[PDB]
Amino acid sequence: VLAQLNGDIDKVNAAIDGAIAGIVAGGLLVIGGAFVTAIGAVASTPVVIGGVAMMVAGAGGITAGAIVLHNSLGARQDLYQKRSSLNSEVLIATQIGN
Amino acid sequence: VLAQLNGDIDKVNAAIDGAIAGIVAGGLLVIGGAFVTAIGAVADFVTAGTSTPVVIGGVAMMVAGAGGITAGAIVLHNSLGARQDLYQKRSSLNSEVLIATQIGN
Amino acid sequence: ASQAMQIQTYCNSVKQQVPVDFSQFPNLKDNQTQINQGLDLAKGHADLYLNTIQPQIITNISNISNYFALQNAIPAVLPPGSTKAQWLRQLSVIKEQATEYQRLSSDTRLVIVNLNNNLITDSSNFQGIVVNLNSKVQGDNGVLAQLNGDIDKVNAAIDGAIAGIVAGGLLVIGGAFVTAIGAVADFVTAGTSTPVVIGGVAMMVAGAGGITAGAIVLHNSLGARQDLYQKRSSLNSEVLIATQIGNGYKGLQVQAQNAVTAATQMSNAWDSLTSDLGSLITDLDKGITSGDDIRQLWLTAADTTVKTVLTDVTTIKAQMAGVSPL
Amino acid sequence: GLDLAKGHADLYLNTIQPQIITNISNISNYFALQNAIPAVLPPGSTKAQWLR
Amino acid sequence: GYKGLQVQAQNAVTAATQMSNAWDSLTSDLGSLITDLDKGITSGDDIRQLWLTAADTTVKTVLTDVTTIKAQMAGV
Amino acid sequence: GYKGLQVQAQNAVTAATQMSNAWDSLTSDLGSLITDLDKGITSGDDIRQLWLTAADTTVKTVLTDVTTIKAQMAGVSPLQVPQTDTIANFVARLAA
């Protein structure tokens, strides 16, 4: 079971990674849209419209990423703890066994 | 207590991993954005003022990216310290719990 | 190696240790206080064994040993010379010698109580010093392992930036050239080679673009990585030095455990002497206050018991023999 | 809890162990007395003083 | 190296102190013996045995320990 | 090689320090014989005998000191063969 869990934990680290990328992608789109907006506020408004579309999307990915992250961290911590429990069980049975 | 500490380590490490991600993606957008900006600025004195949409999107990238590099630094200075606090606190706790069990044994 | 050489060995080892300075390692502020406090205490305990306790035990056994080396027998039948009034005085003397020698033994054992407790506290202090250091070390390896992955991920950014700079120069050298063909063809026949000049400069501007940007990004990516592996080689130092110090204190705790066993074994030897003298005192008492065959029975036993005292005395003397080497 | 444990350990080491070593001393003395009888009671000795 | 050598020096003070004191205990005991003798608490004949028992036991340890120490220091 | 040489030098130093100690004992004990012989000479009868008797004991101690030094200083050291490196091992130590 331990060796299988180790792959499982590896596998799930992709979700945590993916959600971090998401958030930063989000954050980037906001820095960008924020800049494109102040731009349009000079000149005329067609671009300001993109700007907010960009910041809205940005925040979407941050809000979605954040939820995807909470979940994926939780499902991982459940695996860690199951693992550490076995690890401790192998350790005890081995010591007692010897 | 153990799950709370484990959860904060998860958060502090996710915060740092994303800080890095910013620095990485950031630099890409900077470089990316400079290629795009050059292409637009030249296709701007070719097409009289047609392609200002792309010069803008180019500069916007570099700005994003740069903010992504500048942010990922703030966060990597204000996290490295807090991560060593949390691990030391966690190892402390494991040790002390074991000592409690040993006393019982 | 005798029981006293065991304890000496610990004493000479502990006395030579040096207070640790962890001032370059804020994570270890507390491990420093605990160590230097533990050590100062152990140093006092070690001095007192060498200055006081060992001398007292040895002195005490010397007195006891001198007396019973002479009085190595109990006259259990009235001896050819004496009368009965002065037989019963001879015996009453010895009874009182051994009553006095009994309390001294008991008071030697109570000193050994203090010594056992002193070694045990030291052994304990060192157990805890080792445990806390291991905590800290285990903490740090958690971090080191995260710092590692963290460094690998930044090496991406640096590789990217280098890739960007090299693609930059290539775009410039190649762009320059295409611009030169385009530009020289328009000069000979204006108009004909317009998308070439245009593409040439696109590439040229883009290139110096990537070069300038790439180098910025590289300067930051190197800075960021350098902070990371200097934080990393501080932990490696912190681990190494917590480990050396720690393995020193594992050693000191084993030297002190050994001494505990030795001092316990002294406790045991003195307990027997005390108890064997008890029997002597009993045998002489009943001996004195009894009649005929009865008197003799007790006094024979007392004699048998004196040989046992002598046994016990050689035991302690073996225990306190010697001057441990370096 | 620990302090009360070390209290129990201390009672063993400083009250019971010495009582056990004392018991052994008492074995030594008891056999000193047992082996002393033939010494005090030569061959032509009576049941009465064997009993005494 | 510097710290360890101040610690080594400190040890040398503590042991010098204990040795100075040992000489003191000797000179004082020898003085009491002199007083006592001078006021008839004991006789040279008393002293004579106490000094004879000493040499065969307690002094033979000091004298033993001397050639043991000279040995250690000489590597023999 | 220079590691092995510094070890040999550190043993040499220990042996030379231990020489120093034994010569210091001979020195100090002879100071004691001198002290006894003097006080004995300039003294008379029972006190003479006292000093002189110690002097005797000391002279016994002095021979100890001498037999100890003589022990440090006897012997001719045998040849030491350091097994050194061959070609097949050196060519092999490059390949790794």
Residue numbers in the entry:
A (entry chain D): 159 to 201, 209 to 263
B (entry chain I): 159 to 263
C (entry chain F): 17 to 342
D (entry chain I): 54 to 105
E (entry chain G): 264 to 339
F (entry chain J): 264 to 359
What does the article say, verbatim?
The structure of AhlB was determined to 2.9 Å in space group C2 (Form 1), using Se-Methionine SAD and subsequently the resolution was extended to 2.5 Å, using data from a crystal in space group C2221 (Form 2). The decameric AhlB pore is constructed from five dimers of the Type1 and Type 2 conformations, with the Type 1 conformation an intermediate on the soluble to pore transition. Major conformational changes have occurred when compared to the soluble structure, which are centred on rotations about two hinges, hinge 1 (K152-L160 and R248-A254) and hinge 2 (L186-G191 and A222-G225). Indeed, the transition to form AhlB Type 2 from AhlB Type I is an extension of the same hinge movement observed between the soluble and type I conformations. The interface between dimers is constructed from α5a of the Type 2 AhlB monomer (residues I350, A251, F353, L357 and L360) packing against α4 of the Type 1 AhlB monomer (residues L256 and I257) and α3 in AhlB Type 2 (residues V146 and V147) of the neighbouring dimer. However, if a pore is made using the AhlB type 2 conformation alone with AhlC, no steric clashes occur, further indicating that the AhlB Type 2 conformation is likely to be that of the active pore structure. Unlike in ClyA where the α3 and α4 head inserts into just one leaflet, the equivalent hydrophobic head region of AhlB is of sufficient length to cross both membrane leaflets, indicating that AhlB may be the pore forming component of the system.
We show that the orthologue identified in A. hydrophila (AhlABC) is a haemolytic tripartite α-PFT, requiring all three components for maximal lysis, and we present the structures of the soluble forms of monomeric AhlB and tetrameric AhlC and the decameric pore form of AhlB. AhlC provides the initial single leaflet insertion, assembly with AhlB then producing an oligomeric hydrophobic pore, and finally recruitment of AhlA produces a hydrophilic fully active AhlABC pore. Structural and sequence analysis suggests this method of pore assembly may well occur throughout the tripartite α-PFT family.
